[PDB]
Structure 1
Amino acid sequence: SHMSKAFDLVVIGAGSGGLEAGWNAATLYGKRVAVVDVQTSHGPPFYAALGGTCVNVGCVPKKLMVTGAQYMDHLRESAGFGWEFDGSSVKANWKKLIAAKNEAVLDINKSYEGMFNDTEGLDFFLGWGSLESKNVVVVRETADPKSAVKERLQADHILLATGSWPQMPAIPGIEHCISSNEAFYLPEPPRRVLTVGGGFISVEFAGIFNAYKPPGGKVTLCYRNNLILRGFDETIREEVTKQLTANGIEIMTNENPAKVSLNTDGSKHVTFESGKTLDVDVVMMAIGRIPRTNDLQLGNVGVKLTPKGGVQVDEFSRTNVPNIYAIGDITDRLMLTPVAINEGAALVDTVFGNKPRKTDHTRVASAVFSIPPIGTCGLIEEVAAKEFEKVAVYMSSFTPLMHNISGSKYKKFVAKIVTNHSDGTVLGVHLLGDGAPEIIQAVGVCLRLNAKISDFYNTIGVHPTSAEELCSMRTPSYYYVKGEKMEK
């Protein structure tokens, strides 16, 4: 006999949260830390890898792809500013985009491999981790619990940071579908695609495919309810629909796939609940992400799950079992890279540092890299209204000037500030238009600072920008007093 490798902390999942935790504990509390993940670089079969979802199959590569997409707009829009070239000569090369995105992701993988190798107290382990018991973490050959054990890891504390995975509805033909995962690796651009879901990934991939589809190509997005983007400011959801339609993407609302069968030429025949049908080369299922709890064998130690099925955790990320924590998408709060980063740091502060700290989950700034994009932070009006007696809304939506010249007149900029009209505290900011995501960041700081609308208007404009619009609104566009919209 001989000893198992021993750690202060073992983290399952080398992603947005786990990596911040592992890093913080190794470089700032002098701890020995094990991080398990299922591949060392991006791609099939498991897509996520060293770096996590954000890095291999999320924020980073999609943003490249959305930048890739924006050139369709750019090239068209430049004629207005006098640019001339052979429009007939223009083709959008997917192969070449993917190959770019790929090796860029690979550099991030390779770069984090090197940082493990270079950081004393931080080691990586390739495989599937699970819980044999409350202080033992087994790393196995595959997700199957009968796969050969690779190593047993003795751990004082255990960090569950496995993230989330696409939710695939049980319908006939679901095997004929794909997910965000596979989208990143289509070998050639789909000609007709249907993205299923009215959420941020679907809306996003739609514009991507929209830009890179060949010939008489068509992109259809569908949503089970009236209006895409549940959770976002309601003017934005409408504007963004009209703008997605304008770039030639079509929206199916109050529609939901019920089955998919294969056509004899390999294409996809989709029947919705309503009897309706649609033929596409690809069906991208993007209807929700579910916490990834199944391979962890949490039964072995009895970690309680919420009804929705995420790892239940207190405001400090602790499970019903001492020394086991969870952060990030597996917890089913806000599914965002920076919330997982801020969650892991805080956990490590709490447990290894002198300074206990908990993640603030309100007033989190976020974006949607649609074309144009949304930038948002804080409460939307319909929520604000329920919880505050008097709520004011300030609004503005010129179609901006450059887009009068550029040809895309359909490209509005909406800006919205939602306030507690009783003292003027800004509860929420909601934007759609070019630069929206870049603008919203400091608004985050503003909110954490309890900024009042008076603080917004009293600050002096930067001209000429779209952001200056936010310091020009002084008169409310309308209100809500106890629950009810009014206007005066």
Structure 2
Amino acid sequence: KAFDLVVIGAGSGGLEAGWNAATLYGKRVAVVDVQTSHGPPFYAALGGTCVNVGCVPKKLMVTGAQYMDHLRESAGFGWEFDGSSVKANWKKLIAAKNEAVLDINKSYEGMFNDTEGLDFFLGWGSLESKNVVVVRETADPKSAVKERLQADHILLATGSWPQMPAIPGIEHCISSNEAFYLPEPPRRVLTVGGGFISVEFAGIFNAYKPPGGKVTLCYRNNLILRGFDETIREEVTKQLTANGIEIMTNENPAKVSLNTDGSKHVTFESGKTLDVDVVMMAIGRIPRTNDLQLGNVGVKLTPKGGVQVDEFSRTNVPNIYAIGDITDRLMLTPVAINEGAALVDTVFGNKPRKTDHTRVASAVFSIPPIGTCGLIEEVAAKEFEKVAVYMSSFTPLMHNISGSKYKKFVAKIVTNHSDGTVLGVHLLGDGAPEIIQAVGVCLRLNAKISDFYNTIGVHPTSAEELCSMRTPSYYYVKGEKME
């Protein structure tokens, strides 16, 4: 049939775009996805990666993982129970997560049923012609044509996909996609990658591992979580270690084979070896463009595989747009959502708007978690003559009593010292993701450190640290650190 807009991918960005165009601009909209509910074989489905195999399940599972800390920490506050009766039933967690995800899948289905002028098509979308999306049975372009959709405008919103290194024994390794469906919690697991997904999963597995289990995280580079504040990177390495995770830095899997008992035998380029039940590859995500047959319309790609866009999410081909991870800009659900909103307003509203990819509040659901917004000091040091760093690090009192004396809360404010303007705020510790949200609004309003210090604290909180730093800890002048 004929549509004002065809969206390929029913994810974070695609549903924002498709709903807005139908409901706010009264366009006739078609959206395509490969599955109506979560899990094998295509993992992402109606709802997107975040709903099905990202933010949503992972948050529920980290929340589950956090009770390992609460059960132990309760004792400092005089809670007593039979420690030897304690089991982390991973099957109950997964079943709980699956229902939660299926409920979302179902509500999106009902949304398509209940919303006139917004139509779902199941299967594989690809570009036939610059105004025709073909929906097929499989990813294979030979496969049978379920639909052919005439389209004034086409939005590519197919998101990203885990990266698997071409090494021998790749086949004995999983991504985060399979991790969400492990039938049993691995006794020993290697997470491969120093990024948020490896770290967040190392925490999940560490809490639900059967007795005498072990979690190992490996990263090629010296220090996990590049892109994050360096003090936070080092402090989070220490606090993961304190909770019994083995962080193997400057190490990479050369090869995986099977022990005769089917457990996975890891050889690191360093001549180290490890035997584990699971190797989870979390080394990167690449934009999903192969199946889109973008050759048929000549949509400009990067070598990486990303769809190249201007600031308004417009491709080199007019009437064809891309938003979300497929653009390989910032791979976060609220950024994809913002891109979809901004696009539809631009194209169908004539309310021209670009997404601002700077000063984007984000979190890592590590144990403990990270909250961050804006520049780290190294980046700011290259762009500003004078950078001030305000830093407060302290084990909070609750965590003297709790027994987790290692759980130091870190708060860091990075400023342009020439005028006090806050460039970056970086938090590690319980509450960090909740604290940082309204800090996003502060940086949109060009808050200065005097706007933080002059704000009266909420006490007792971790957050009030942000409002109690009067004096820099150190500086960068012309890119050079100075204590």
TM-score, normalising length: structure 2: 1.00
Q: Separation in 1 of the partners of 2:307 and 2:247?
A: 34
Q: Separation in 1 of the partners of 2:342 and 2:229?
A: 30
- The offset of 1:306, in angstroms, is 1.6
- What secondary structure, in the 3-state scheme, does the structure 1 residue paired with 2:126 have? strand
Cα shift readout 1:87-135 (whole Å, capped 9, x = no counterpart): 1110000001000000010000001100110000001000000011101
- The offset of 1:275, in angstroms, is 1.6
Does the 8 Å contact 2:167/2:255 carry over to 1? yes
Cα shift readout 1:319-357 (whole Å, capped 9, x = no counterpart): 000011000000001000000000000000000003110
Cα shift readout 1:351-398 (whole Å, capped 9, x = no counterpart): 000311000010000000000100000000000000100000000011
- What secondary structure, in the 3-state scheme, does the structure 2 residue paired with 1:170 have? coil
- The offset of 1:272, in angstroms, is 1.1
Q: Separation in 1 of the partners of 2:223 and 2:420?
A: 30
Cα shift readout 1:234-283 (whole Å, capped 9, x = no counterpart): 00000000000000001000001111112211110111111211111000
Residue equivalent to 1:202: 198
- The offset of 1:58, in angstroms, is 0.4
Q: Unaligned stretches of 5+ in structure 2?
A: none
- What secondary structure, in the 3-state scheme, does the structure 2 residue paired with 1:237 have? helix
Taking the TM superposition and a 5 Å limit, the aligned residue runs for 1:89-488 are: 89-487=85-483
- What secondary structure, in the 3-state scheme, does the structure 1 residue paired with 2:237 have? helix
RMSD: 0.5
Cα shift readout 1:1-57 (whole Å, capped 9, x = no counterpart): xxxx11000000000000000000000111110000000000100100000000000
- What secondary structure, in the 3-state scheme, does the structure 2 residue paired with 1:22 have? helix
Cα shift readout 1:393-419 (whole Å, capped 9, x = no counterpart): 000011000000000000000000000
Does the 8 Å contact 2:288/2:305 carry over to 1? no
- What secondary structure, in the 3-state scheme, does the structure 1 residue paired with 2:183 have? coil
- The offset of 1:308, in angstroms, is 2.4
- The offset of 1:218, in angstroms, is 0.3
Structure 1 segments of 4 or more deviating over 3 A?
none
Identity of aligned residues (%): 100
Q: Unaligned stretches of 5+ in structure 1?
A: none
Q: Separation in 2 of the partners of 1:129 and 1:367?
A: 32
TM-score, normalising length: structure 1: 0.99
> Which residue among 20, 23, 46 is the counterpart of 1:24?
20
- What secondary structure, in the 3-state scheme, does the structure 2 residue paired with 1:335 have? coil
Count the aligned residue pairs.
Answer: 483
Q: Say which is worse superposed, 262-271 or 414-423, in terms of deviation.
A: 262-271
Does the 8 Å contact 2:36/2:109 carry over to 1? yes
Cα shift readout 1:426-457 (whole Å, capped 9, x = no counterpart): 00000000000000000000000000000000
Cα shift readout 1:207-245 (whole Å, capped 9, x = no counterpart): 000000001100000001000000000000000000000
Q: Separation in 1 of the partners of 2:242 and 2:169?
A: 32
- What secondary structure, in the 3-state scheme, does the structure 1 residue paired with 2:222 have? coil
Q: Separation in 1 of the partners of 2:313 and 2:303?
A: 17
- What secondary structure, in the 3-state scheme, does the structure 1 residue paired with 2:91 have? helix
Q: Separation in 2 of the partners of 1:216 and 1:144?
A: 45
- The offset of 1:307, in angstroms, is 2.9
Q: Separation in 2 of the partners of 1:192 and 1:80?
A: 29
Q: Separation in 1 of the partners of 2:258 and 2:318?
A: 50
Cα shift readout 1:300-320 (whole Å, capped 9, x = no counterpart): 111111232210000000100
Q: Separation in 2 of the partners of 1:124 and 1:428?
A: 41
1:9 aligns with 2:24: no
- What secondary structure, in the 3-state scheme, does the structure 2 residue paired with 1:310 have? coil
- The offset of 1:140, in angstroms, is 0.2
Q: Separation in 1 of the partners of 2:285 and 2:252?
A: 17
- What secondary structure, in the 3-state scheme, does the structure 2 residue paired with 1:17 have? helix
